[PDB]
């Protein structure tokens, strides 16, 4: 009975799911366009944790002493002190993380943090560390602006639907909301400098690999 009911439903090249009549069952397969084979459980950091712990893990301040970024974490850590521009960028990043926290707490009322998602970023960062033999005692050569702009560019490259109009662009931006949340929670400046003392080469490698990997993760048109 089940096989006959859903027999003729297929993913088409416009990424929608339709039956033999062309009727739309859903406007993107699985509501995010990724195939099940490439999903796997991952943690959403921002959902859990106390406000103080969340701020400590994510907030970075170049001006005040409450959450100062230790200068030893960057090859220009001393210079960045002040620089209202970098502070504005980091404040925007923290506001985005707070918005993600609120949005996720809305989506998952019970606060569950482990949910399937396409690309496993923990493995990507572990691979970067093992490949580049990153030394945890050498102040990384990354810069706050580089990190922020790289993450934003990656988010811009999270292509599922490739239309040029505004309806398809809204759909595509919606389809990557949760993966963007995972990225922002995982690639926070503070985390990328303290927890994962990556270098610029490793950061570029991680971003490129994430791009490629979820691009390989998207469902194939013609899938029955």
């Amino acid at each position: 009975r089940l096989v006959k009911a859903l027999e003729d439903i297929m993913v088409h090249y416009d990424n929608t799911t339709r039956n033999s009549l062309g009727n739309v069952i859903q406007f993107i397969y699985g509501e995010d366009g990724m195939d099940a084979a490439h999903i796997e459980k991952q943690s959403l950091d921002t959902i859990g944790g106390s406000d103080a712990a969340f701020e400590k893990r994510y907030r970075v301040d170049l001006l005040n002493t409450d959450h100062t970024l230790d200068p030893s974490l960057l090859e220009s850590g001393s210079e960045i002190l002040g620089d209202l521009k970098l502070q504005v960028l980091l404040d925007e990043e923290y506001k985005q993380l707070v918005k993600d926290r609120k949005f996720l707490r809305e989506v998952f009322v019970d606060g569950e943090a482990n949910w399937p998602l396409p690309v496993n970023i923990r493995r990507i960062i572990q691979n970067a560390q093992q490949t580049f033999h990153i030394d945890h005692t050498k102040p990384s050569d990354l810069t706050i602006k580089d990190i922020v702009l790289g993450v934003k560019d990656l988010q811009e490259n999270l292509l599922v639907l490739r239309g040029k109009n505004e309806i398809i662009q809204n759909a595509q931006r919606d389809a990557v909301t949760l993966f963007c949340c995972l990225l922002r929670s995982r690639l926070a400046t503070r985390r990328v400098l303290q927890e994962y003392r990556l270098t610029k080469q490793a950061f570029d490698w991680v971003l490129s690999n994430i791009e490629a990997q979820f691009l390989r993760s998207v469902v194939h048109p013609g899938e029955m």
Partner: protein, 279 residues
């Protein structure tokens, strides 16, 4: 329950009482029809004290008339234990009977403290009983007894049987931001009457849920019906621990709910559609 009443106990019991369906038949021991021409007294010493209790109250009322007085006594003896369990008093049942029998049945009450919970009733028939206790047909009293024991809803929601209040934990953000388990009191019933139970005061209408997704569709719409159907499928599949990806069950429910209504996978549902004849 509502957020301001969930953490407590007795308010949950009050909601239980407001929802749970209960009739006279659940509290009555036996119903007896007795012969008693006397409208103000009785040949039965057992009911003499009860009659005297209301003799100074009812028979002393102005505009005394026998139109509601008959020689037949429909004596119901209730269960004290059952009434105590349901938090029912002679009051509630009496005015419910009055509501169903505004002026077609003169009803006498027994004192709650009395060991004999008695509802002494007489037939009503104006223009024939006005000044006499004429022998009304006993079948009239038997029909009245049927109506009392079947068609009288003392309290609760129709089609809602035993309501089982129980406690289990739900995660809510602590003021520090951490998710902590806050014990909550809820009710799990039998039979579905969403359309009424939603409106009962004291319940959080935004959280009420049922496993009969058809009623969810009827009351909340096709989108809530689809969500409830997915929840039911997920519960069925995860009852054994093993789980399937969200996409498969989401696709199944989406297919079942594309036509603005619940479609079955039978030959009456997807098979009677617009698809190809050979398909």
């Amino acid at each position: 329950l509502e957020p301001g009443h969930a953490a407590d106990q007795e308010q949950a019991k009050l909601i239980r009482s407001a929802i749970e369906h209960t009739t006279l038949k659940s509290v009555t021991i036996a119903s007896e029809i007795y012969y008693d021409p006397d409208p103000r007294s009785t040949v039965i010493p057992e009911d003499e004290e009860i009659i005297q209790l209301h003799f100074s109250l009812l028979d002393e009322e102005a505009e005394q008339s026998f139109d509601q007085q008959s020689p037949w006594l429909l004596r119901l003896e209730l269960d004290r234990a059952a009434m105590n369990d349901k938090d029912l008093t002679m009051g509630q049942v009496g005015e419910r009977i009055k509501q169903t029998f505004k002026n077609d049945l003169f009803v006498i009450w027994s004192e709650d403290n009395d060991e004999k919970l008695i509802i002494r009733c007489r037939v009503v028939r104006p223009k024939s009983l006005d000044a006499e206790t004429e022998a009304e047909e006993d079948h009239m009293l038997k029909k009245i007894e049927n109506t009392m024991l079947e068609n009288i809803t003392l309290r609760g929601v129709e089609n809602i049987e035993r309501v089982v209040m129980m406690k289990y934990d739900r995660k809510v953000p602590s003021p520090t931001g951490e998710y902590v388990k806050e014990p909550e009191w809820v009710l799990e019933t039998d039979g579905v009457n969403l359309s009424e139970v939603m409106t009962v005061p004291g319940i959080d209408p935004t959280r009420i849920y049922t496993n009969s997704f058809i009623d969810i569709m009827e009351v909340l719409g096709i989108e809530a019906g689809r969500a409830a159907l997915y929840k039911e499928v997920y519960n069925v599949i995860a009852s054994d621990g093993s789980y399937v990806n969200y996409r498969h069950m989401a696709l199944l429910v989406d297919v079942m709910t594309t036509q603005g209504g619940l479609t079955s996978v039978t030959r009456h549902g997807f098979n009677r559609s617009n698809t190809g004849a050979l398909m």
